[PDB]
Protein backbone atom coordinates (compact mmCIF):
# COMPACT_ATOMS: atom_id res chain seq x y z
CA UNK A 1 0.00 0.00 0.00
CA UNK A 2 1.74 3.14 -1.29
CA UNK A 3 0.13 5.97 -3.31
CA UNK A 4 1.59 7.45 -6.50
CA UNK A 5 4.14 10.28 -6.07
CA UNK A 6 2.78 13.80 -6.57
CA UNK A 7 4.36 16.58 -8.62
CA UNK A 8 2.66 19.79 -7.47
CA UNK A 9 1.63 21.53 -4.27
CA UNK A 10 0.70 24.84 -2.67
CA UNK A 11 0.90 25.97 0.95
CA UNK A 12 0.21 29.19 2.81
CA UNK A 13 3.35 30.10 4.74
CA UNK A 14 4.25 32.98 7.01
CA UNK A 15 1.40 35.42 7.44
CA UNK A 16 1.12 36.81 3.92
CA UNK A 17 2.85 34.41 1.52
CA UNK A 18 2.05 31.54 -0.84
CA UNK A 19 4.47 28.88 -2.09
CA UNK A 20 3.78 26.55 -5.00
CA UNK A 21 5.47 24.45 -7.66
CA UNK A 22 4.53 22.68 -10.88
CA UNK A 23 6.02 20.02 -13.15
CA UNK A 24 11.43 22.38 -11.67
CA UNK A 25 11.54 25.81 -10.03
CA UNK A 26 9.66 27.16 -7.02
CA UNK A 27 7.99 30.56 -6.98
CA UNK A 28 6.94 32.53 -3.91
CA UNK A 29 3.85 34.74 -3.89
CA UNK A 30 3.27 37.85 -1.79
CA UNK A 31 -0.52 37.60 -1.77
CA UNK A 32 -1.42 39.98 1.06
CA UNK A 33 -4.23 41.89 -0.67
CA UNK A 34 -6.65 38.99 -0.17
CA UNK A 35 -6.63 38.78 3.66
CA UNK A 36 -8.66 40.88 6.12
CA UNK A 37 -5.58 41.85 8.19
CA UNK A 38 -3.13 44.57 7.20
CA UNK A 39 0.51 44.56 8.25
CA UNK A 40 1.01 48.34 8.21
CA UNK A 41 -1.89 48.94 10.60
CA UNK A 42 -0.28 46.54 13.06
CA UNK A 43 2.84 48.70 12.97
CA UNK A 44 0.94 51.98 13.34
CA UNK A 45 -1.71 51.02 15.92
CA UNK A 46 -1.23 52.02 19.56
CA UNK A 47 -2.76 51.04 22.90
CA UNK A 48 -2.45 53.28 25.96
CA UNK A 49 -4.59 52.59 29.02
CA UNK A 50 -3.96 55.96 30.68
CA UNK A 51 -5.53 58.00 27.85
CA UNK A 52 -8.23 56.33 25.75
CA UNK A 53 -9.20 59.50 23.86
CA UNK A 54 -5.78 59.92 22.24
CA UNK A 55 -5.60 56.32 21.01
CA UNK A 56 -8.91 56.52 19.16
CA UNK A 57 -7.95 59.72 17.32
CA UNK A 58 -4.45 58.47 16.48
CA UNK A 59 -5.84 55.21 15.09
CA UNK A 60 -8.50 57.11 13.13
CA UNK A 61 -5.74 59.19 11.57
CA UNK A 62 -3.72 56.06 10.81
CA UNK A 63 -6.73 54.43 9.13
CA UNK A 64 -6.77 57.24 6.55
CA UNK A 65 -3.17 56.51 5.51
CA UNK A 66 -4.40 53.13 4.25
CA UNK A 67 -7.70 54.29 2.78
CA UNK A 68 -10.29 52.25 4.68
CA UNK A 69 -13.58 54.15 4.92
CA UNK A 70 -15.01 51.71 7.47
CA UNK A 71 -12.35 52.07 10.13
CA UNK A 72 -12.43 55.87 10.16
CA UNK A 73 -16.15 55.92 10.99
CA UNK A 74 -15.80 53.10 13.53
CA UNK A 75 -12.95 54.81 15.38
CA UNK A 76 -14.86 58.10 15.27
CA UNK A 77 -17.85 56.48 16.98
CA UNK A 78 -15.53 54.82 19.51
CA UNK A 79 -14.27 58.21 20.71
CA UNK A 80 -17.73 59.50 21.59
CA UNK A 81 -18.88 56.15 22.98
CA UNK A 82 -15.90 55.89 25.35
CA UNK A 83 -15.89 59.41 26.78
CA UNK A 84 -15.25 60.00 30.48
CA UNK A 85 -18.55 61.86 30.94
CA UNK A 86 -20.55 58.61 30.71
CA UNK A 87 -19.21 56.86 33.80
CA UNK A 88 -21.52 54.43 35.59
CA UNK A 89 -22.68 55.35 39.08
CA UNK A 90 -23.12 53.21 42.19
CA UNK A 91 -26.83 53.42 42.95
CA UNK A 92 -29.32 51.80 40.55
CA UNK A 93 -32.05 54.31 41.44
CA UNK A 94 -30.16 57.37 40.22
CA UNK A 95 -29.84 57.10 36.41
CA UNK A 96 -30.05 54.72 33.51
CA UNK A 97 -26.59 53.42 32.57
CA UNK A 98 -25.19 54.22 29.15
CA UNK A 99 -24.84 50.48 28.49
CA UNK A 100 -28.62 49.98 28.29
CA UNK A 101 -28.88 52.90 25.86
CA UNK A 102 -29.37 51.61 22.28
CA UNK A 103 -26.10 53.35 21.34
CA UNK A 104 -24.20 51.27 23.89
CA UNK A 105 -24.10 47.49 24.08
CA UNK A 106 -26.37 46.90 21.06
CA UNK A 107 -24.25 48.94 18.61
CA UNK A 108 -21.06 47.26 19.81
CA UNK A 109 -22.71 43.86 19.42
CA UNK A 110 -23.69 44.85 15.87
CA UNK A 111 -20.20 45.91 14.84
CA UNK A 112 -18.70 42.77 16.40
CA UNK A 113 -21.15 40.53 14.54
CA UNK A 114 -20.37 42.32 11.27
CA UNK A 115 -16.61 41.96 11.55
CA UNK A 116 -16.89 38.32 12.64
CA UNK A 117 -18.27 37.36 9.23
CA UNK A 118 -15.33 39.10 7.52
CA UNK A 119 -12.85 37.20 9.76
CA UNK A 120 -11.17 40.49 10.72
CA UNK A 121 -9.36 39.53 13.92
CA UNK A 122 -7.31 42.71 13.89
CA UNK A 123 -10.33 44.97 14.47
CA UNK A 124 -12.14 42.63 16.86
CA UNK A 125 -9.12 42.39 19.17
CA UNK A 126 -8.69 46.18 19.22
CA UNK A 127 -12.37 46.91 19.83
CA UNK A 128 -12.68 44.32 22.60
CA UNK A 129 -9.64 45.91 24.27
CA UNK A 130 -10.54 49.61 24.06
CA UNK A 131 -13.99 49.04 25.58
CA UNK A 132 -12.64 46.93 28.46
CA UNK A 133 -28.36 42.68 47.57
CA UNK A 134 -29.37 40.74 44.47
CA UNK A 135 -30.33 43.97 42.71
CA UNK A 136 -26.93 45.52 43.43
CA UNK A 137 -25.19 42.49 41.92
CA UNK A 138 -27.48 42.57 38.88
CA UNK A 139 -26.68 46.25 38.34
CA UNK A 140 -22.92 45.63 38.10
CA UNK A 141 -23.49 43.14 35.30
CA UNK A 142 -25.99 45.48 33.67
CA UNK A 143 -23.64 48.49 33.55
CA UNK A 144 -20.92 46.89 31.40
CA UNK A 145 -20.67 47.40 27.64
CA UNK A 146 -19.33 43.86 27.14
CA UNK A 147 -21.46 40.94 28.26
CA UNK A 148 -19.95 39.17 31.31
CA UNK A 149 -21.11 35.85 29.80
CA UNK A 150 -18.75 36.06 26.79
CA UNK A 151 -15.27 36.65 28.25
CA UNK A 152 -13.85 33.52 26.63
CA UNK A 153 -14.47 34.71 23.07
CA UNK A 154 -12.75 38.03 23.77
CA UNK A 155 -9.75 36.25 25.28
CA UNK A 156 -9.58 34.01 22.21
CA UNK A 157 -9.62 37.04 19.91
CA UNK A 158 -6.76 38.68 21.78
CA UNK A 159 -4.67 35.49 21.92
CA UNK A 160 -4.99 34.80 18.19
CA UNK A 161 -4.11 38.38 17.28
CA UNK A 162 -1.07 38.10 19.54
CA UNK A 163 0.07 34.96 17.74
CA UNK A 164 -0.30 36.77 14.41
CA UNK A 165 1.72 39.71 15.71
CA UNK A 166 4.47 37.31 16.76
CA UNK A 167 4.39 35.78 13.28
CA UNK A 168 4.85 39.17 11.62
CA UNK A 169 7.84 40.01 13.79
CA UNK A 170 6.60 42.68 16.20
CA UNK A 171 7.32 41.77 19.82
CA UNK A 172 6.33 44.85 21.82
CA UNK A 173 2.86 45.11 20.28
CA UNK A 174 2.03 41.52 21.20
CA UNK A 175 2.71 42.30 24.86
CA UNK A 176 0.66 45.50 24.62
CA UNK A 177 -2.32 43.54 23.29
CA UNK A 178 -1.91 40.65 25.73
CA UNK A 179 -1.91 43.08 28.66
CA UNK A 180 -5.71 43.33 28.34
CA UNK A 181 -6.57 39.64 28.83
CA UNK A 182 -8.83 39.08 31.84
CA UNK A 183 -7.56 35.59 32.69
CA UNK A 184 -3.90 35.96 33.82
CA UNK A 185 11.43 25.21 38.14
CA UNK A 186 14.91 26.62 38.74
CA UNK A 187 15.43 30.23 39.82
CA UNK A 188 18.11 32.47 41.30
CA UNK A 189 18.58 33.17 44.99
CA UNK A 190 20.58 35.96 46.62
CA UNK A 191 23.30 35.34 49.21
CA UNK A 192 22.69 37.90 51.95
CA UNK A 193 25.46 40.31 52.94
CA UNK A 194 24.86 40.05 56.71
CA UNK A 195 24.00 36.47 57.72
CA UNK A 196 25.69 34.79 54.70
CA UNK A 197 22.60 32.80 53.69
CA UNK A 198 20.59 32.37 50.51
CA UNK A 199 17.68 34.83 50.47
CA UNK A 200 14.54 34.45 48.34
CA UNK A 201 13.82 38.08 47.54
CA UNK A 202 15.37 41.54 47.63
CA UNK A 203 14.86 41.61 51.42
CA UNK A 204 16.27 39.07 53.86
CA UNK A 205 14.40 37.16 56.57
CA UNK A 206 16.78 36.61 59.50
CA UNK A 207 18.26 40.12 59.64
CA UNK A 208 15.50 41.45 57.33
CA UNK A 209 18.14 43.47 55.46
CA UNK A 210 18.93 43.99 51.80
CA UNK A 211 20.36 40.85 50.22
CA UNK A 212 21.85 42.36 47.04
CA UNK A 213 24.47 45.13 46.88
CA UNK A 214 25.53 46.61 43.54
CA UNK A 215 29.12 45.97 42.48
CA UNK A 216 29.72 49.47 41.12
CA UNK A 217 27.99 52.05 43.32
CA UNK A 218 27.57 49.79 46.38
CA UNK A 219 23.93 50.95 46.74
CA UNK A 220 21.29 48.31 47.44
CA UNK A 221 19.32 47.19 44.39
CA UNK A 222 15.58 46.58 44.53
CA UNK A 223 14.44 46.39 40.90
CA UNK A 224 16.17 45.17 37.75
CA UNK A 225 19.48 43.33 38.05
CA UNK A 226 22.02 41.35 36.00
CA UNK A 227 24.47 38.79 37.36
CA UNK A 228 27.20 36.36 36.33
CA UNK A 229 26.53 32.64 36.65
CA UNK A 230 30.14 31.59 37.36
CA UNK A 231 31.55 34.14 39.80
CA UNK A 232 28.28 35.80 40.79
CA UNK A 233 28.86 39.55 41.07
CA UNK A 234 25.90 41.61 39.94
CA UNK A 235 24.33 45.02 40.05
CA UNK A 236 22.11 47.50 38.25
CA UNK A 237 21.68 47.05 34.51
CA UNK A 238 22.85 50.53 33.52
CA UNK A 239 25.93 50.23 35.74
CA UNK A 240 27.07 47.26 33.67
CA UNK A 241 25.95 48.98 30.49
CA UNK A 242 28.68 51.46 31.41
CA UNK A 243 31.23 49.02 32.86
CA UNK A 244 31.27 46.04 30.51
CA UNK A 245 31.17 48.47 27.58
CA UNK A 246 34.99 48.37 27.37
CA UNK A 247 36.57 46.23 30.10
CA UNK A 248 36.26 42.44 30.16
CA UNK A 249 37.05 41.70 33.81
CA UNK A 250 35.07 41.52 37.02
CA UNK A 251 34.45 44.99 38.50
CA UNK A 252 35.11 43.62 42.02
CA UNK A 253 38.67 42.38 41.58
CA UNK A 254 37.69 38.81 40.82
CA UNK A 255 39.49 37.89 37.61
CA UNK A 256 36.36 36.37 36.05
CA UNK A 257 35.90 37.45 32.43
CA UNK A 258 32.15 37.49 32.88
CA UNK A 259 31.34 38.45 29.29
CA UNK A 260 32.61 35.05 28.12
CA UNK A 261 31.41 32.85 31.00
CA UNK A 262 27.85 34.23 31.23
CA UNK A 263 26.47 34.84 27.72
CA UNK A 264 25.81 31.20 26.92
Amino acid sequence: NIPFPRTSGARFCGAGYLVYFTRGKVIIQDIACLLPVHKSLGELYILNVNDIQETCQKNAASALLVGRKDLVQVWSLATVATDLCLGPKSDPDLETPWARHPFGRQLLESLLAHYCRLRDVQTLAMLCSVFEERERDQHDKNKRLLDPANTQQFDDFKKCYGEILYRWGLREKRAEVLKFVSCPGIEFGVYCSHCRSEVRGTQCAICKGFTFQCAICHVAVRGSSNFCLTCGHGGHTSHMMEWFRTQEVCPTGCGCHCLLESTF
Partner: peptide, 6 residues
Amino acid sequence: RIIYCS
Protein backbone atom coordinates in the same frame (compact mmCIF):
# COMPACT_ATOMS: atom_id res chain seq x y z
CA ARG B 1 -23.81 63.53 12.72
CA ILE B 2 -21.06 60.91 12.39
CA ILE B 3 -23.69 58.41 11.23
CA TYR B 4 -25.35 60.55 8.55
CA CYS B 5 -22.69 62.80 6.98
CA SER B 6 -19.21 61.55 6.09
